[PDB]
Design an enzyme around this catalytic site. Structure first.
Site, PDB file in Angstrom:
ATOM      1  CB  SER A  42      -0.957  -0.008   1.187  1.00  0.00           C
ATOM      2  OG  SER A  42      -0.208  -0.091   2.380  1.00  0.00           O
ATOM      3  CG  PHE A  43       3.447   2.278   2.805  1.00  0.00           C
ATOM      4  CD1 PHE A  43       2.589   1.495   3.578  1.00  0.00           C
ATOM      5  CD2 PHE A  43       4.792   2.323   3.139  1.00  0.00           C
ATOM      6  CE1 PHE A  43       3.062   0.732   4.623  1.00  0.00           C
ATOM      7  CE2 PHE A  43       5.288   1.549   4.231  1.00  0.00           C
ATOM      8  CZ  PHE A  43       4.410   0.764   4.960  1.00  0.00           C
ATOM      9  N   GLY A  44       4.605   1.181  -0.924  1.00  0.00           N
ATOM     10  CA  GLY A  44       5.920   1.014  -1.497  1.00  0.00           C
ATOM     11  C   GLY A  44       6.021  -0.309  -2.216  1.00  0.00           C
ATOM     12  CE  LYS A  61       9.537  -2.301   3.014  1.00  0.00           C
ATOM     13  NZ  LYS A  61       9.568  -3.199   4.194  1.00  0.00           N
ATOM     14  CB  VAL A 112      17.294 -13.762  -0.056  1.00  0.00           C
ATOM     15  CG1 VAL A 112      17.278 -15.275   0.277  1.00  0.00           C
ATOM     16  CG2 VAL A 112      18.021 -12.968   1.015  1.00  0.00           C
ATOM     17  N   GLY A 115      13.598 -17.016  -2.864  1.00  0.00           N
ATOM     18  CA  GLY A 115      12.186 -16.776  -2.763  1.00  0.00           C
ATOM     19  C   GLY A 115      11.660 -16.912  -1.340  1.00  0.00           C
ATOM     20  CE  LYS A 157       3.394 -10.681   6.084  1.00  0.00           C
ATOM     21  NZ  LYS A 157       2.292  -9.890   5.458  1.00  0.00           N
ATOM     22  CD  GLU A 159       3.723 -11.431   1.870  1.00  0.00           C
ATOM     23  OE1 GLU A 159       2.808 -11.482   2.717  1.00  0.00           O
ATOM     24  OE2 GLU A 159       3.695 -10.597   0.957  1.00  0.00           O
ATOM     25  CG  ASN A 160       7.360 -10.652   6.153  1.00  0.00           C
ATOM     26  OD1 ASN A 160       7.270 -10.312   4.956  1.00  0.00           O
ATOM     27  ND2 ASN A 160       6.743  -9.993   7.131  1.00  0.00           N
TER      28      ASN A 160
HETATM   29  C1  LIG Z   1       5.283  -1.885   2.954  1.00  0.00           C
HETATM   30  S1  LIG Z   1       5.178  -1.745   1.199  1.00  0.00           S
HETATM   31  O1  LIG Z   1       3.817  -1.296   0.834  1.00  0.00           O
HETATM   32  O2  LIG Z   1       6.322  -0.978   0.728  1.00  0.00           O
HETATM   33  C2  LIG Z   1       5.374  -3.385   0.630  1.00  0.00           C
HETATM   34  C3  LIG Z   1       6.378  -3.632  -0.239  1.00  0.00           C
HETATM   35  C4  LIG Z   1       6.568  -4.865  -0.706  1.00  0.00           C
HETATM   36  C5  LIG Z   1       5.774  -5.869  -0.312  1.00  0.00           C
HETATM   37  O3  LIG Z   1       6.019  -7.107  -0.817  1.00  0.00           O
HETATM   38  C6  LIG Z   1       5.243  -8.239  -0.459  1.00  0.00           C
HETATM   39  C7  LIG Z   1       6.158  -9.424  -0.828  1.00  0.00           C
HETATM   40  N1  LIG Z   1       5.578 -10.702  -1.155  1.00  0.00           N
HETATM   41  C8  LIG Z   1       5.213 -10.781  -2.565  1.00  0.00           C
HETATM   42  C9  LIG Z   1       3.977  -9.963  -2.921  1.00  0.00           C
HETATM   43  O4  LIG Z   1       4.128  -8.595  -2.624  1.00  0.00           O
HETATM   44  C10 LIG Z   1       3.921  -8.251  -1.262  1.00  0.00           C
HETATM   45  C11 LIG Z   1       4.754  -5.662   0.582  1.00  0.00           C
HETATM   46  C12 LIG Z   1       4.547  -4.395   1.049  1.00  0.00           C
END
Ligand code: A1JEO
EC number: 2.7.11.11
Length: 339
Positions: A42-44, A61, A112, A115, A157, A159-160
Protein backbone atom coordinates in the site's frame (compact mmCIF):
# COMPACT_ATOMS: atom_id res chain seq x y z
CA UNK A 1 25.17 -21.14 29.82
CA UNK A 2 27.66 -18.34 30.32
CA UNK A 3 28.62 -18.63 26.64
CA UNK A 4 25.09 -17.72 25.54
CA UNK A 5 24.87 -14.98 28.17
CA UNK A 6 28.15 -13.45 26.97
CA UNK A 7 27.05 -13.76 23.34
CA UNK A 8 23.82 -11.86 24.06
CA UNK A 9 25.66 -9.23 26.15
CA UNK A 10 28.03 -8.52 23.26
CA UNK A 11 25.11 -8.55 20.82
CA UNK A 12 23.37 -5.86 22.87
CA UNK A 13 26.51 -3.70 23.16
CA UNK A 14 27.02 -3.77 19.40
CA UNK A 15 23.34 -3.05 18.70
CA UNK A 16 23.25 -0.10 21.10
CA UNK A 17 26.29 1.57 19.55
CA UNK A 18 24.64 1.61 16.10
CA UNK A 19 21.21 2.38 17.58
CA UNK A 20 22.58 5.51 19.29
CA UNK A 21 24.37 6.70 16.11
CA UNK A 22 22.47 5.55 13.02
CA UNK A 23 24.02 5.53 9.58
CA UNK A 24 22.33 7.70 6.95
CA UNK A 25 22.65 8.59 3.29
CA UNK A 26 25.02 5.81 2.23
CA UNK A 27 24.06 5.55 -1.52
CA UNK A 28 21.85 7.23 -4.15
CA UNK A 29 19.32 6.04 -6.74
CA UNK A 30 21.45 6.57 -9.86
CA UNK A 31 24.11 4.20 -8.49
CA UNK A 32 21.74 1.32 -9.37
CA UNK A 33 20.00 -0.18 -12.40
CA UNK A 34 16.40 -1.28 -11.83
CA UNK A 35 15.70 -4.89 -12.86
CA UNK A 36 12.30 -6.16 -11.69
CA UNK A 37 9.55 -5.57 -9.10
CA UNK A 38 9.50 -8.42 -6.55
CA UNK A 39 6.57 -7.31 -4.38
CA UNK A 40 4.25 -4.40 -3.79
CA UNK A 41 2.03 -2.97 -1.10
CA UNK A 42 0.00 0.00 0.00
CA UNK A 43 2.92 2.45 0.31
CA UNK A 44 5.92 1.01 -1.50
CA UNK A 45 7.52 -1.85 -3.36
CA UNK A 46 10.61 -4.03 -3.38
CA UNK A 47 12.70 -4.08 -6.57
CA UNK A 48 15.67 -6.17 -7.67
CA UNK A 49 18.44 -3.70 -8.57
CA UNK A 50 22.07 -4.04 -9.65
CA UNK A 51 24.82 -1.71 -8.44
CA UNK A 52 26.38 -0.16 -11.54
CA UNK A 53 29.99 -0.18 -10.34
CA UNK A 54 30.25 -3.44 -8.42
CA UNK A 55 27.66 -5.52 -10.28
CA UNK A 56 26.17 -6.71 -6.98
CA UNK A 57 22.43 -7.41 -6.79
CA UNK A 58 20.23 -6.03 -4.03
CA UNK A 59 16.57 -5.95 -3.00
CA UNK A 60 15.69 -2.24 -2.78
CA UNK A 61 12.61 -1.30 -0.75
CA UNK A 62 11.19 1.99 -2.06
CA UNK A 63 8.63 3.78 0.13
CA UNK A 64 6.61 6.73 -1.13
CA UNK A 65 6.87 9.42 1.58
CA UNK A 66 3.44 10.87 0.89
CA UNK A 67 1.79 7.44 1.17
CA UNK A 68 3.70 6.64 4.36
CA UNK A 69 2.31 9.81 5.92
CA UNK A 70 -1.24 9.20 4.66
CA UNK A 71 -1.32 5.62 5.99
CA UNK A 72 0.14 6.71 9.37
CA UNK A 73 3.35 4.70 9.02
CA UNK A 74 5.92 7.46 9.81
CA UNK A 75 7.11 6.06 13.14
CA UNK A 76 7.02 2.49 11.83
CA UNK A 77 9.19 3.46 8.87
CA UNK A 78 11.72 5.23 11.11
CA UNK A 79 11.71 2.17 13.41
CA UNK A 80 12.33 -0.15 10.45
CA UNK A 81 15.39 1.67 9.16
CA UNK A 82 16.93 2.46 12.56
CA UNK A 83 16.58 -1.16 13.71
CA UNK A 84 17.83 -2.68 10.44
CA UNK A 85 20.96 -0.57 10.38
CA UNK A 86 21.75 -1.66 13.99
CA UNK A 87 21.10 -5.47 14.00
CA UNK A 88 23.38 -8.32 12.92
CA UNK A 89 22.32 -11.96 13.09
CA UNK A 90 22.76 -14.96 10.71
CA UNK A 91 19.02 -15.24 9.96
CA UNK A 92 18.21 -11.55 9.33
CA UNK A 93 18.47 -9.97 5.87
CA UNK A 94 21.27 -7.37 5.97
CA UNK A 95 20.69 -3.70 5.18
CA UNK A 96 23.52 -2.55 2.92
CA UNK A 97 22.58 1.09 2.14
CA UNK A 98 19.85 3.59 2.92
CA UNK A 99 19.02 7.04 1.57
CA UNK A 100 16.11 9.32 0.68
CA UNK A 101 15.28 11.82 -2.04
CA UNK A 102 12.53 14.36 -2.72
CA UNK A 103 9.87 11.62 -3.05
CA UNK A 104 10.98 8.29 -1.57
CA UNK A 105 12.77 6.45 1.21
CA UNK A 106 15.12 3.62 0.20
CA UNK A 107 16.41 0.60 2.11
CA UNK A 108 18.82 -1.45 -0.01
CA UNK A 109 19.00 -5.01 1.37
CA UNK A 110 20.90 -8.12 0.34
CA UNK A 111 19.02 -9.98 -2.38
CA UNK A 112 17.96 -13.53 -1.42
CA UNK A 113 17.23 -15.35 -4.70
CA UNK A 114 15.55 -18.47 -3.31
CA UNK A 115 12.19 -16.78 -2.76
CA UNK A 116 9.71 -16.61 0.10
CA UNK A 117 8.96 -19.63 2.25
CA UNK A 118 5.29 -18.96 1.41
CA UNK A 119 5.88 -20.00 -2.24
CA UNK A 120 7.72 -23.21 -1.29
CA UNK A 121 5.18 -24.17 1.37
CA UNK A 122 2.20 -23.64 -0.93
CA UNK A 123 3.92 -25.58 -3.72
CA UNK A 124 4.72 -28.65 -1.62
CA UNK A 125 1.60 -28.51 0.57
CA UNK A 126 3.17 -29.00 3.98
CA UNK A 127 6.66 -29.53 5.40
CA UNK A 128 7.58 -32.68 7.30
CA UNK A 129 8.19 -32.13 11.02
CA UNK A 130 12.02 -32.23 10.63
CA UNK A 131 11.78 -29.63 7.84
CA UNK A 132 9.44 -27.40 9.86
CA UNK A 133 11.71 -27.86 12.91
CA UNK A 134 14.82 -26.74 11.01
CA UNK A 135 13.11 -23.43 10.11
CA UNK A 136 11.45 -23.05 13.54
CA UNK A 137 14.85 -23.40 15.28
CA UNK A 138 16.14 -20.43 13.26
CA UNK A 139 13.15 -18.31 14.27
CA UNK A 140 13.61 -19.27 17.95
CA UNK A 141 17.25 -18.14 17.85
CA UNK A 142 16.31 -14.98 15.94
CA UNK A 143 13.61 -14.05 18.46
CA UNK A 144 16.00 -14.78 21.34
CA UNK A 145 18.41 -12.31 19.74
CA UNK A 146 15.80 -9.62 18.94
CA UNK A 147 14.04 -9.85 22.32
CA UNK A 148 17.34 -9.57 24.19
CA UNK A 149 17.77 -6.20 22.39
CA UNK A 150 14.29 -5.16 23.60
CA UNK A 151 12.97 -5.51 20.01
CA UNK A 152 9.57 -7.00 19.13
CA UNK A 153 9.28 -8.18 15.53
CA UNK A 154 5.45 -8.28 15.04
CA UNK A 155 5.34 -9.50 11.42
CA UNK A 156 6.13 -13.22 11.44
CA UNK A 157 4.49 -15.04 8.50
CA UNK A 158 5.79 -17.33 5.69
CA UNK A 159 5.88 -14.41 3.21
CA UNK A 160 8.57 -12.70 5.34
CA UNK A 161 10.93 -15.67 5.53
CA UNK A 162 13.26 -15.83 2.53
CA UNK A 163 15.19 -19.03 1.73
CA UNK A 164 18.86 -18.49 0.88
CA UNK A 165 21.32 -20.39 -1.28
CA UNK A 166 22.17 -22.74 1.60
CA UNK A 167 18.50 -23.38 2.44
CA UNK A 168 18.56 -21.18 5.57
CA UNK A 169 16.04 -18.51 6.50
CA UNK A 170 16.59 -14.78 6.13
CA UNK A 171 13.86 -12.71 7.86
CA UNK A 172 12.77 -9.62 5.89
CA UNK A 173 10.31 -6.76 6.53
CA UNK A 174 10.99 -4.86 9.76
CA UNK A 175 8.09 -2.45 9.07
CA UNK A 176 6.38 -3.38 12.38
CA UNK A 177 9.53 -4.00 14.45
CA UNK A 178 9.91 -1.74 17.48
CA UNK A 179 12.21 -1.19 20.46
CA UNK A 180 9.90 -1.75 23.46
CA UNK A 181 11.04 -2.35 27.02
CA UNK A 182 7.54 -3.01 28.33
CA UNK A 183 4.19 -2.84 26.58
CA UNK A 184 3.15 -1.42 23.25
CA UNK A 185 -0.31 -0.79 21.79
CA UNK A 186 -0.41 -0.51 17.98
CA UNK A 187 -2.76 -2.74 15.98
CA UNK A 188 -0.53 -4.29 13.33
CA UNK A 189 0.28 -7.65 11.78
CA UNK A 190 -1.54 -10.02 9.46
CA UNK A 191 -4.84 -11.43 10.78
CA UNK A 192 -3.94 -15.13 10.87
CA UNK A 193 -0.87 -14.44 13.03
CA UNK A 194 -2.23 -11.94 15.59
CA UNK A 195 -2.14 -12.87 19.29
CA UNK A 196 -5.41 -12.51 21.23
CA UNK A 197 -4.07 -9.55 23.23
CA UNK A 198 -3.47 -7.62 19.97
CA UNK A 199 -7.03 -8.35 18.78
CA UNK A 200 -8.38 -7.23 22.19
CA UNK A 201 -6.54 -3.85 22.03
CA UNK A 202 -4.45 -4.55 25.17
CA UNK A 203 -0.98 -3.26 26.01
CA UNK A 204 1.01 -6.26 24.77
CA UNK A 205 4.63 -7.37 24.87
CA UNK A 206 7.14 -9.70 23.22
CA UNK A 207 4.91 -12.69 24.01
CA UNK A 208 3.04 -11.85 20.77
CA UNK A 209 6.07 -13.04 18.77
CA UNK A 210 6.00 -16.43 20.55
CA UNK A 211 2.26 -16.75 19.73
CA UNK A 212 3.11 -16.00 16.09
CA UNK A 213 5.80 -18.71 16.18
CA UNK A 214 3.08 -21.19 17.22
CA UNK A 215 0.96 -20.13 14.23
CA UNK A 216 3.98 -20.44 11.90
CA UNK A 217 4.94 -23.92 13.13
CA UNK A 218 1.32 -25.08 12.80
CA UNK A 219 1.06 -23.69 9.28
CA UNK A 220 4.40 -25.18 8.18
CA UNK A 221 3.45 -28.65 9.50
CA UNK A 222 -0.23 -28.61 8.44
CA UNK A 223 -0.17 -26.54 5.26
CA UNK A 224 -2.77 -24.03 6.56
CA UNK A 225 -2.96 -21.82 9.66
CA UNK A 226 -4.74 -22.87 12.87
CA UNK A 227 -7.39 -20.14 12.99
CA UNK A 228 -8.29 -20.07 9.31
CA UNK A 229 -11.58 -18.52 8.25
CA UNK A 230 -12.89 -16.51 5.25
CA UNK A 231 -12.96 -13.03 6.82
CA UNK A 232 -10.81 -11.32 9.49
CA UNK A 233 -13.66 -10.97 12.00
CA UNK A 234 -14.18 -14.75 11.88
CA UNK A 235 -10.43 -15.38 12.20
CA UNK A 236 -10.34 -13.09 15.25
CA UNK A 237 -13.23 -14.96 16.88
CA UNK A 238 -11.34 -18.25 16.50
CA UNK A 239 -8.07 -16.76 17.81
CA UNK A 240 -9.60 -15.40 21.01
CA UNK A 241 -11.59 -18.62 21.66
CA UNK A 242 -8.73 -20.69 23.08
CA UNK A 243 -9.45 -23.82 21.00
CA UNK A 244 -7.43 -25.36 18.13
CA UNK A 245 -7.74 -28.58 16.12
CA UNK A 246 -4.60 -30.49 15.29
CA UNK A 247 -4.27 -32.88 12.32
CA UNK A 248 -3.88 -36.48 13.46
CA UNK A 249 -0.55 -36.68 11.61
CA UNK A 250 0.99 -34.18 14.08
CA UNK A 251 3.28 -35.84 16.63
CA UNK A 252 2.28 -35.70 20.31
CA UNK A 253 5.37 -33.55 21.00
CA UNK A 254 4.36 -31.07 18.27
CA UNK A 255 0.82 -30.78 19.69
CA UNK A 256 2.21 -30.18 23.17
CA UNK A 257 4.57 -27.43 22.03
CA UNK A 258 1.78 -25.75 20.03
CA UNK A 259 -0.67 -25.79 22.96
CA UNK A 260 2.00 -23.94 24.98
CA UNK A 261 2.81 -21.35 22.25
CA UNK A 262 -0.88 -20.87 21.28
CA UNK A 263 -1.79 -20.22 24.90
CA UNK A 264 -4.41 -17.45 25.03
CA UNK A 265 -3.29 -16.36 28.51
CA UNK A 266 -0.06 -14.51 27.75
CA UNK A 267 1.16 -15.04 31.35
CA UNK A 268 1.19 -18.83 30.72
CA UNK A 269 2.63 -18.79 27.18
CA UNK A 270 5.95 -20.46 26.38
CA UNK A 271 8.66 -17.88 25.77
CA UNK A 272 7.03 -15.63 28.39
CA UNK A 273 7.60 -17.73 31.56
CA UNK A 274 10.40 -17.45 34.12
CA UNK A 275 12.72 -19.58 31.95
CA UNK A 276 12.04 -17.52 28.82
CA UNK A 277 13.19 -19.05 25.58
CA UNK A 278 14.67 -22.10 27.32
CA UNK A 279 11.19 -23.60 27.81
CA UNK A 280 11.06 -23.70 24.00
CA UNK A 281 14.64 -24.82 23.32
CA UNK A 282 14.34 -27.67 25.88
CA UNK A 283 10.94 -28.88 24.73
CA UNK A 284 10.80 -32.49 23.51
CA UNK A 285 9.83 -31.42 19.98
CA UNK A 286 13.30 -29.82 19.71
CA UNK A 287 15.20 -32.77 21.26
CA UNK A 288 17.04 -33.53 17.99
CA UNK A 289 18.04 -29.87 17.41
CA UNK A 290 21.69 -28.86 17.83
CA UNK A 291 21.15 -25.15 18.59
CA UNK A 292 24.84 -24.23 18.15
CA UNK A 293 25.12 -26.07 14.82
CA UNK A 294 22.00 -24.25 13.53
CA UNK A 295 23.46 -20.87 14.58
CA UNK A 296 26.77 -21.75 12.91
CA UNK A 297 24.94 -22.87 9.71
CA UNK A 298 26.58 -26.30 9.95
CA UNK A 299 23.37 -28.35 9.56
CA UNK A 300 22.54 -29.57 6.06
CA UNK A 301 19.28 -27.92 5.03
CA UNK A 302 16.23 -30.01 4.05
CA UNK A 303 15.67 -28.07 0.86
CA UNK A 304 17.86 -25.99 -1.46
CA UNK A 305 15.93 -23.59 -3.73
CA UNK A 306 16.45 -23.92 -7.47
CA UNK A 307 17.88 -20.80 -9.07
CA UNK A 308 20.55 -20.03 -11.64
CA UNK A 309 22.58 -17.30 -9.98
CA UNK A 310 22.46 -14.19 -7.82
CA UNK A 311 20.37 -12.27 -10.39
CA UNK A 312 17.75 -15.01 -10.97
CA UNK A 313 14.16 -13.83 -10.21
CA UNK A 314 12.35 -17.09 -11.11
CA UNK A 315 11.32 -17.73 -7.49
CA UNK A 316 9.45 -14.37 -7.36
CA UNK A 317 6.29 -13.48 -9.27
CA UNK A 318 5.24 -10.83 -11.76
CA UNK A 319 3.89 -7.36 -11.02
CA UNK A 320 3.06 -4.35 -13.17
CA UNK A 321 6.27 -2.36 -13.58
CA UNK A 322 5.82 1.25 -12.49
CA UNK A 323 8.09 4.31 -12.68
CA UNK A 324 10.33 5.37 -9.79
CA UNK A 325 9.54 9.05 -10.07
CA UNK A 326 11.38 11.66 -8.03
CA UNK A 327 9.74 15.08 -7.66
CA UNK A 328 11.65 18.29 -8.34
CA UNK A 329 10.24 19.48 -4.98
CA UNK A 330 10.98 17.94 -1.58
CA UNK A 331 7.98 16.15 0.00
CA UNK A 332 7.54 15.49 3.73
CA UNK A 333 11.06 16.62 4.61
CA UNK A 334 10.34 17.34 8.27
CA UNK A 335 8.63 14.01 8.94
CA UNK A 336 11.64 12.03 7.69
CA UNK A 337 14.51 14.23 8.97
CA UNK A 338 16.09 11.37 10.93
CA UNK A 339 15.95 8.84 8.08
C1 A1JEO B 1 5.28 -1.88 2.95
S1 A1JEO B 1 5.18 -1.74 1.20
O1 A1JEO B 1 3.82 -1.30 0.83
O2 A1JEO B 1 6.32 -0.98 0.73
C2 A1JEO B 1 5.37 -3.38 0.63
C3 A1JEO B 1 6.38 -3.63 -0.24
C4 A1JEO B 1 6.57 -4.87 -0.71
C5 A1JEO B 1 5.77 -5.87 -0.31
O3 A1JEO B 1 6.02 -7.11 -0.82
C6 A1JEO B 1 5.24 -8.24 -0.46
C7 A1JEO B 1 6.16 -9.42 -0.83
N1 A1JEO B 1 5.58 -10.70 -1.15
C8 A1JEO B 1 5.21 -10.78 -2.57
C9 A1JEO B 1 3.98 -9.96 -2.92
O4 A1JEO B 1 4.13 -8.60 -2.62
C10 A1JEO B 1 3.92 -8.25 -1.26
C11 A1JEO B 1 4.75 -5.66 0.58
C12 A1JEO B 1 4.55 -4.40 1.05
Amino acid sequence: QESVKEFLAKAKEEFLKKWESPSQNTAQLDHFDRIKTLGTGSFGRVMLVKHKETGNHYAMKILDKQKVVKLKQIEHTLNEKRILQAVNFPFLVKLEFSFKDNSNLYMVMEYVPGGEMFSHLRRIGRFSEPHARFYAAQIVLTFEYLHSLDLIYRDLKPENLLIDQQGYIQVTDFGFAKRVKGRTWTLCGTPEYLAPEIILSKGYNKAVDWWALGVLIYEMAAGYPPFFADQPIQIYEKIVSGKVRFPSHFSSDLKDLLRNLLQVDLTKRFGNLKNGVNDIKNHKWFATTDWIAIYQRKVEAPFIPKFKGPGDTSNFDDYEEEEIRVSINEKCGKEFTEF
